[PDB]
Structure 1
Amino acid sequence: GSHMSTLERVVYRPDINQGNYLTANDVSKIRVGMTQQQVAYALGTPLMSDPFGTNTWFYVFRQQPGHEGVTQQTLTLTFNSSGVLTNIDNKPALSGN
């Protein structure tokens, strides 16, 4: 994106170079059946910093080649009325960032 500067990262926490957000590894960590609080802790609370405010969570996939028009794959977590995981919606991202 326009804000290409990836200098901010809070502290030195090496793994991915392409971001400081959630990746595929952590998606593989979670599972349907647990709550919002469970996933928020398993995955890491989203940018808004308040996961328990919404029922639709948006996350990103691990450092991948992006061999298409779209590169990334977004994780959209869907929670029911109770705040329980119903579906892990993993579909393609924007054509960039």
Structure 2
Amino acid sequence: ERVVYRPDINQGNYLTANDVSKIRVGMTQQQVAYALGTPLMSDPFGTNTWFYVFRQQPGHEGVTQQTLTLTFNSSGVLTNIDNKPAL
């Protein structure tokens, strides 16, 4: 409560609203991967579902997570789209 010194959270693999619109339903795995760059978050053991994360806070003023995660069926086909902003 007496430290103005804080950093900004230099983490990404973020999203563009372009990236947002970039993908629609049932779009296939390789297709979406190229269309959005490979992901880095996806369950070790569960389904083919995928995550995609935005991450920041500029220090003392609000933390901005923004992840969309991405469900996937058996045959590498999208099944559902799942965004989430901060909190």
TM range (shorter): 0.5 to 0.7
Q: Larger relative contact order (C-alpha < 8 A, sep ≥ 6)?
A: 2
The two structures, once aligned, show a CA RMSD in angstroms of: 8.1
Question: What is the aligned-residue identity percentage?
Answer: 100
Matches of 1:41 and 1:12, distance apart in 2: 39
Is the CA contact 1:22–1:59 (under 8 Å) kept in the aligned structure 2? yes
Gaps of 5+ in 1: 1-7
Is the CA contact 1:33–1:84 (under 8 Å) kept in the aligned structure 2? yes
Matches of 1:23 and 1:9, distance apart in 2: 35
Is the CA contact 1:36–1:52 (under 8 Å) kept in the aligned structure 2? no
Larger Rg: 2
Instruction: State the TM-score, normalizing by the size of structure 2.
Output: 0.60
TM-aligned CA distance change 1:17 to 1:79, over 3 Å:
same
Instruction: State the TM-score, normalizing by the size of structure 1.
Output: 0.55
Query: How many pairs align?
Result: 87
Is the CA contact 1:32–1:85 (under 8 Å) kept in the aligned structure 2? yes
Gaps of 5+ in 2: none
Give runs of ≥4 in structure 1 deviating > 4 Å: 8-18, 48-54, 61-70
